[PDB]
Amino acid sequence: TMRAVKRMINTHLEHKRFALINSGNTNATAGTVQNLSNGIIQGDDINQRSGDQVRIVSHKLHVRGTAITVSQTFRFIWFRDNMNRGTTPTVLEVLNTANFMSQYNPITLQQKRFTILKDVTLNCSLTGESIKDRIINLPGQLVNYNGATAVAASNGPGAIFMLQIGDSLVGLWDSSYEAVYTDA
Amino acid sequence: TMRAVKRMINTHLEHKRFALINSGNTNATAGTVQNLSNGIIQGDDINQRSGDQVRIVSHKLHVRGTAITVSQTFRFIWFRDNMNRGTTPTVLEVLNTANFMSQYNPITLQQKRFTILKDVTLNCSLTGESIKDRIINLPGQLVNYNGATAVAASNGPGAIFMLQIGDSLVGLWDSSYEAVYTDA
Amino acid sequence: TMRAVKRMINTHLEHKRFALINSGNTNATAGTVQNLSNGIIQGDDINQRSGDQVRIVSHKLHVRGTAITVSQTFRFIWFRDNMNRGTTPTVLEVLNTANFMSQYNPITLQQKRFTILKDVTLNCSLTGESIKDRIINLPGQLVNYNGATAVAASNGPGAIFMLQIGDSLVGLWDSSYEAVYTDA
Amino acid sequence: TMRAVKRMINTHLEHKRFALINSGNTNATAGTVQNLSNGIIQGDDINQRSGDQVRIVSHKLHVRGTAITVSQTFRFIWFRDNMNRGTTPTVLEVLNTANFMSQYNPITLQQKRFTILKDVTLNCSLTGESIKDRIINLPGQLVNYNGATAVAASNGPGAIFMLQIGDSLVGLWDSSYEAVYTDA
Amino acid sequence: TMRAVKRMINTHLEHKRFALINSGNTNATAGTVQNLSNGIIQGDDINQRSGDQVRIVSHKLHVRGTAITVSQTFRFIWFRDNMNRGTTPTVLEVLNTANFMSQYNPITLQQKRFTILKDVTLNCSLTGESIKDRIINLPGQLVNYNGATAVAASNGPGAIFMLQIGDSLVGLWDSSYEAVYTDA
Amino acid sequence: TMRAVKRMINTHLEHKRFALINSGNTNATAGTVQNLSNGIIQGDDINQRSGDQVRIVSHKLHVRGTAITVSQTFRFIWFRDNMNRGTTPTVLEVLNTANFMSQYNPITLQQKRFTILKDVTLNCSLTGESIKDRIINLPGQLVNYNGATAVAASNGPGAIFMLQIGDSLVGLWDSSYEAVYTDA
């Protein structure tokens, strides 16, 4: 019976879509954290939200690494921040050490501060597959906001981030992100 | 049980209303296509939409023709464009020939490009009922948009149009349109 | 169960459509018989047939009379010829006498030579409703042909005709015809 | 019981087949959209249609990319246009931006203007697998047409297209397409 | 079971048809009674009877009045004489007074001398609908005869008549009558 | 139970009988069509009809060919015309070509214009059985007429004909026909 409720309710709720592209970035040893869900700002457009809450029905992540000069490994971490208070998470909050071989931070994952959605490691070789890509599609959850604009202060619980970290600074990595959500 | 769902859900969704008036237009031999649902633009007002989708619960069409100089026939076609891509439909896409006696286009109706809601023909005579009117009330369906403003490029699948065509160019026809819709 | 067969089969058969217009004709005392289904000719187009048989799912007739000079009556007979052998039926085969008040021919209707679909009589007055129209929509049956082109010799059993007869020779009557058929 | 209907009906309907080959084309940054189902024209031959509707039982897509000069990525999008009105779709209607990393257009996919059948990305490296191919076989649906010939104006709802877009202009990509359909 | 008897028996009995036309008659104040079923005479033709009895399966009456000079009312009475003895009924036997506003004769209708099938009153105005018509189709009953020819002496119980009476002597009224009967 | 109805009804209906003889006719290459049921004319005699309809309970055909000079083949076609309009059918309407080896006309038999009752081919040899005969007895159906006399214009749907065609013009063929029918 609950299935009928989903059909009945979701047929009356617009499934807004937001598209994000981030191409041309270099590989990092210390690492970087990239905002994906923050592009959803306040407004009456299809790629915007009313209020500070949106339910993401599903979202897609696409990454692609390229090897330059030397063979290198690209690591991508797709996680969810359930305790954000208006800040872009650092790398040391997600990993025990700032190394691509590092494991997740024991303190933060015990608290369930972050939820890992998918961790991807790409090895791109000059003498082999110099280019390597992967696509991930997963369901989403509720996403809160602490503001209106697309600045870090607008992030809230349920924020969406991607962590990139590797063994070289010369390779180039590209990514894209799309989300399907309801704003009611 | 599904009836309770409708009551439960529709009691929590605002039923926005949009009113449209179009009076003083002359009768046409070649014909004209008039936008009705495009007046719904983006915004936070009661006669506006958020996003690019709205479900029309019901809508009403009112037409009225007047005979001037000579007796003439007013034909009104109330149809739905389910394949709009940002254009106001022409008359030859709806009729085999640009004549008030013409039948619907076989190619487009086979594809279900247009859905006919109600076709009305009014005969107004100088020696008789010089004035003649009719009111139509029907349920609505989902209406998409390809933009934000009230220009033709904003029209999308589910658009609402009215086709007017007659045997004279001197008569005057007036119309009105109201829609009750939910924007969630 | 037979309902499912109709859905299963008709979803795989193209519903070809043919549109016919005939406007500007004068009213007749002796009467005239007009071909409607003969425009369907052999070919691979949407308004054509392969072979010499087509099943008409439904068809529509639209007529409109206008009074000129004097008040006059327009009579329209929409019948089906189930015994055609390559000829356009005459008026005396359909009516006992060549008069708009005449009844159907007793000899031919006993044989079921013709099947009456709808008989329409319009009275158009100069001091009243100078113009009068009517629309008829009915299901169709099998239609055979005795040729390929759009000449009278191509007509066969199941042909579609309209008989027009009135009390004056000055009035003008217009008509249109559309058919939805399967050619398999 | 409905299974028997499929066997009973499909044993009496010819399964026409159409073969298409497109080889020697260069990789594109802005992208290109290729017609596949338009080669089916009107006629009485096995690779032709009668009317403007055909049901595609199944269809197959074959692609193959080759790396020249530099390593490059080939992206292939196999989609269905359900709202075509006589035009070859552009790339910006299918992607948010004209980039191989771009996501699908939020506005058009919300409307269900296009249906994605299969998206394929091939990475061809000079130091590795310089050549890479893939074969896709899927069931088909109804395909309408707006004309008779093999020009873009003949395309209609259900049209079949392939989008090719990459990160270089020197690589060469080849493709083939076959469809099995019934024309009744 | 009795339904099968009707099908079994009526499939073996010829359904003879008789057509009658009476056009160009003037409106009457005192009134006139017109013979309709008397045209059925003795013979071996399709519009004739053997003996003096026929069962009328169904019969149709068509009337049409026209206004001349002044606006006038046409009254038509379609009745059945169940006690005829070889005479054409008068108007005073059917109406209390020889006036178009008169009610049926109390003495004769108490006896069931006449059976009223349909009473029609047409108001034709020079400034409005100068012409007005009506068609009636009803089942029939047994019809006896007192002779062989088409004279009044041949009428018997079950005879069919029409009474015409109005408020002017200048208008023209026309009529037609057809009957479907079995002669076994 | 329906069997009792047949006994009950047929015991009260006279079974009229009509006898026809046609002897001394020569064999034909182009062929000839002979009227058999037309001898039933209007009247009160036992071999006549009242009206224009008769139900033939059963009918019998007898043919006999004789060889003269050279051996020859006699072909006899006993068919029923269900779409007659007052004409004696030609040979080209029944056969694709005017040859004794010809097959039935594809166009007319698709329409069911003619119903084949029995086709008989007799080969008569001078050195063998110079004479050869055959008798056929079949049930009948309803037979309509378009007139009263025994001319071709009196033929109607359900008419009865025999087609004779052979490979020589010197042989002599004889025939007879009897029908048992009810005229009620």
Next chain:
Amino acid sequence: TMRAVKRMINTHLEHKRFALINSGNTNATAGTVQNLSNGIIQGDDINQRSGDQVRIVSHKLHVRGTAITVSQTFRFIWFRDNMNRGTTPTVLEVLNTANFMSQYNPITLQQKRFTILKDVTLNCSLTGESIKDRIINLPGQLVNYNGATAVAASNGPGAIFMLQIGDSLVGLWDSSYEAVYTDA
């Protein structure tokens, strides 16, 4: 239930008919193979096909031999080629030796290359029945084609042929062939 499917489907499919005549041919010792189903060519006519497949509902074969000079035997073989690749079968593929007394080829019938429908042998004597004929009516099966025209290259699996072989070269044999098929 499957019977209803046949009625439901076959009532919507035209039963095209093709008529073939072949008269005046001499008897053969070595034998000859005659094309019967190849006359069905591509087109939109009633005696034509769309595509390269047709289902033959039923087909009829008529043969007739005549004795000239000396008494001779006519042998007729009506077979089906289920493995045709664009060639008219030879006589040695159907018979072990080129003799009218020969049996079927063991190699080809083991493979089921040919399917025998009916084998007819006629003995025509000058001192007896100089002429002898036979008619065969059988159901049909699917018939494929490898082309469009009526040449041998157009023949495919399911082709229809007749083999004629006898003990003399002076006799004359005639034949005809008709087929009832659906082209959907």
Next chain:
Amino acid sequence: TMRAVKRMINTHLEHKRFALINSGNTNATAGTVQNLSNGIIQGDDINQRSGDQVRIVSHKLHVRGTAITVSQTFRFIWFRDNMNRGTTPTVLEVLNTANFMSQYNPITLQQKRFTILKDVTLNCSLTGESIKDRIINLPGQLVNYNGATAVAASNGPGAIFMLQIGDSLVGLWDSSYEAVYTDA
């Protein structure tokens, strides 16, 4: 259940075929016995056997007699020798006397030495049917051999023979024989 065994086993066993022709032989008064099954010799070909046993699934006999000079009777006896020891049976072992009117030998048929499959007598007259033929198809049984080659010494139990005997020495008779057998 045993039916399934036949299908299961016979689908895995080759059905070898052997064709035999014997034409141009004269009619005999004393009679002659002809070998039919002996042509099956040892080898790996389709018309050969491995070992000395074969099961004949079915076999066919075709005979044809011709009258020369005087009218004569051809008698054909198709029998089976179940006790053969390497000899071609004589005529006196099959008939009480060497006469075409003779009955079967009482001594040998009591022992079931021979099994009669079909006895055919043809009367061919110069003034009538000078030629007469007959075809017989029957199931077969096990056939043993006493050798390898096609000589009489190779015959064994189950051998197949035909006895020909008549009242004249001038007529010519022809025959053919085919067998379908399994060699496992």
Next chain:
Amino acid sequence: TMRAVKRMINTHLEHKRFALINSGNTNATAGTVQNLSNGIIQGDDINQRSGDQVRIVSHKLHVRGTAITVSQTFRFIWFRDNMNRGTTPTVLEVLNTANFMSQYNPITLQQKRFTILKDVTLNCSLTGESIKDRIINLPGQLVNYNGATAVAASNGPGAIFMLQIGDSLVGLWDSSYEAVYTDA
């Protein structure tokens, strides 16, 4: 129960095996068709057949391509000819065009002339996996023959072939084939 039949019967039937090797062949642009099942000839050896039929229980295909000079693609088509008449199939009968990217021939596959068992495409790169191989194991069906020796004329329905076609003429491809069959 039918499973026991398979065990019971197959335990008494020898499972003959045939081994085929074909190494050192160059890649082809136009393509080549290779005989695999023809090596089975007549005889009493384990790799031979008696008669002209064998049931292949299972068969195995092994292919291996090598890149020389330039990177190239090897395409292998493993199909079954069900309508062979003593010929090695050409490439144009299996493919619409003589290109490695070509699709299967629509005309021949509609007829089911060929049955595709497995299509394999190998891409061999000089900078990567210069060598690439694949092994296929499938069940078999009945295989007929039209001769005795290992020439093309000996091929029959059920023949086994492999089609090789590529984009270069310098690469070398090798293959092997083994079949397990019963000859009873």
Next chain:
Amino acid sequence: TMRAVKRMINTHLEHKRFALINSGNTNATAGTVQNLSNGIIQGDDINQRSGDQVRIVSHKLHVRGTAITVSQTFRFIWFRDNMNRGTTPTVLEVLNTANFMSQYNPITLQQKRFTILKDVTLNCSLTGESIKDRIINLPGQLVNYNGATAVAASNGPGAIFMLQIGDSLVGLWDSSYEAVYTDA
């Protein structure tokens, strides 16, 4: 019911986490054994234990090899020491010989001295994938200790080790280890 116990108990027990990283080590021919679980020392911190027992709910192993100078194979053995007495296991206790191709020691695995969790072999080529990695996640068991500090003497039954051994001494391998355990 036991499932509820797990939920009830594990919700009250802290799931301590320990993170270990070991990067920059060279490949070994003789091999090396690395301590992973010994980093868990006594204390009140989250990455420490109270007592000498901890239950590991789950643990993760990550390895990554890199090829330098020459292509080489990295072998990783992830095992459990269930009989430790305060010593780091040697390589000869785990393998029959100190070779990367060696099998496990028969004597020690019979005793179940070591339990193999996962054995991974990575082949890294200079002309191909110079870098190769793998991630393993498995449940854990009880882990005892014989001390307090992170020296080898502190190891006890249930210890966790990784064995690395390869065919070269120039390659570099990196690893990480994380464990989730309860200390109650």
